[PDB]
Design a protein around this ligand. Sequence first.
Ligand SMILES: Nc1ncnc2c1ncn2[C@@H]1O[C@H](COP(=O)(O)OP(=O)(O)O)[C@@H](O)[C@H]1O
Lengths: 412, 91, 81, 78
Amino acid sequence: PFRDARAAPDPVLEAGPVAHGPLPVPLVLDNGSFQVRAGWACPGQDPGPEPRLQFRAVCARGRGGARGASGPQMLRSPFDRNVPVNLELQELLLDYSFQHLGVSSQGCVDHPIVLTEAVCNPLYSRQMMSELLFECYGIPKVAYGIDSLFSFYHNKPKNSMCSGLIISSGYQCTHVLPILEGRLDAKNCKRINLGGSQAAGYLQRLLQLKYPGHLAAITLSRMEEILHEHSYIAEDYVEELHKWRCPDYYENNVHKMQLPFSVFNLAAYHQLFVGTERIRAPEIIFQPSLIGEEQAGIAETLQYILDRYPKDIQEMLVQNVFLTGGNTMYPGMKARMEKELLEMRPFRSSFQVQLASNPVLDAWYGARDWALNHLDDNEVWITRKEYEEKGGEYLKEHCASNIYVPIRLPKQ
Amino acid sequence: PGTVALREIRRYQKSTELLIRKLPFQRLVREIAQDFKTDLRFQSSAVMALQEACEAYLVGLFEDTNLCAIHAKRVTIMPKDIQLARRIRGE
Amino acid sequence: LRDNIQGITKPAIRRLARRGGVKRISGLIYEETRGVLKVFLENVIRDAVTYTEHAKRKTVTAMDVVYALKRQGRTLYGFGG
Amino acid sequence: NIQGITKPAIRRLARRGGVKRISGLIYEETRGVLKVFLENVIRDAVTYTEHAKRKTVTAMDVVYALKRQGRTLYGFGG
DNA sequence: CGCTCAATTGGTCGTAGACAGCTCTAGCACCGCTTAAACGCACGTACGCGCTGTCCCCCGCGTTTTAACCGCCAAGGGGATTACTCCCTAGTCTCCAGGCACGTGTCAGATAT
Ligand SMILES: Nc1ncnc2c1ncn2[C@@H]1O[C@H](COP(=O)(O)OP(=O)(O)O)[C@@H](O)[C@H]1O
């Protein structure tokens, strides 16, 4: 059968840690349309033991006058299309995270922080986010970067001017990130508007249409079992759905987990047979025309960005295709990706596909190991005295982070 | 100005004769009959009974299309107003 | 040639529209109307011929079409029957 | 007493018809549509019943009324 | 913000077409009157499945406060109207010509007065 989810962890702490040399340990925080992930950096230790608040970033409140329902225990979330675009829920999300991390004594957030932002972040959203971060929370200095570049910075061979493609996936997007000598080539980076939410919503809608006996019993929190544990991505899609065509393959390979139980009962508590369906929700990022929506998908975007470039700079970067975030958790992902890439490389040419050491957590460990090294790069971090003149759109172009564009925003 | 068409409405609502040219209509009636079946030929009264039924039917369609556009807060008809006027009739 | 139903002229369809009481007419409406006008004969001439084919005559009478119009729920006076 | 056909029942009929958003003046105006339809099939049926001279309004008299309106039905009498 | 002007909607004269009373005809089913068939109104006589209040939990409803939406504000630029420019085909009416029907043909060859 299905399991069910679990909640109410013990992230209860004293007001904060203290470490040798400069005393203020930085906070490391990831945004996330699926889940937020956070912690104190734990500097001077490599085996960073306790990331905390690894929680589904969706909230409510008790409208009868009870409590703010920020943490784990209809619903709203502070992100749209992977960019934060909210205040009235973003506040109680950050307050909840800061309660469990601890604040040292009073009505200001004492320690410096590193925080994730979108592959490109709309100028106004950084303005609103920095305005919350400095008007309300009052942090002394702040750093920004991308989950994908942080998880790459974690998985690099060396702390050097490496180059590659980063392939990223998550709730409402996947992005292809051409990085040249540590610099994101933002003029020819691309994204597809599909990923985890679309795959889960699609797998739901398939089972809603295929099994009209159980229409309220199936829900996204049950789709996540079959999506993250029973599904796999094809090595070649027409080759997998071809071998599903014969019943002797089907009945042996099909997954068959019962609904939660109380005519041989399964007409009410069905095994919800999935065979091609446990491939279709994975394929969405490769063929978005499995949904209605026309976009190139990962294979044609990967080809499209490469033919922007001279043939030598292709060969020296395609040596590091890195897989990270979200849907890259599917079993068989590397074996699909390297086949789709072999089909479009020059005939004898070499390439290598690298999968993250932990495709969900490595963004935090990347930002952590980054902050542990860049701790006193006082030119890199956005300092509170810089936000005292810079309007909140501002960014500084440090390694493993987004590209600033010189610009100014009217606000009153 | 762009609106004195409202005087055409009143003129062609005062008028009650048939509006399509008899020869074009008779040619079309015969062509549709002849590719349907061989040696069908029409008395003038049958072509007139056809044309009166056609033009009364189209005046009904235009009245129905008028109410669809008026309901859509328009003062203009587009082919979509006719396609509602068909589906809402079941045509 | 003009046999493409365009022989049902723009101003004639527009005059039927004006008797029908409609104001501004978009330029695709004439052709959409010619589509309906064919289909009305694909009902009426076709069934009228099934009444002509009751007697198996060469002449279509006003009776033959009035019977088709009667079964199609659009009865007509002045011709009798 | 029309209020015996309920606010959720008038919503349910529209939801069985597949409707998304609505505005609540639909409910009493729909009771108006239903009132004239229901009155028509009743008055037609009683008109067929009184030709058969019985005081007991009877299923086939309702069938003759519905069949005059072009509608065919079964299980009751059919 | 109410005029002058350039155009109809509506008015008077015109002319012959399209009625409606003849002016009968004569074909026919209507009206009269018995004849005759069989079932309509009458009607017991079998016995009932609509309605009358007990017992018990179901559905509709009011209340509440989020948050999508229709009604609305104004502007956006392209496609429908108002009007002129020119090309053709709808209607006139003509002669051609042929199918349906009626009729004389006739005399033959098949049938019976
Ligand atoms: N298992 C998962 N399933 C779905 N999405 C996930 C999963 N793990 C991580 N993500 C995705 O990671 C994406 C980007 O990285 P994330 O850790 O959330 O930081 P950020 O949004 O700031 O870039 C998000 O869009 C999120 O949905």
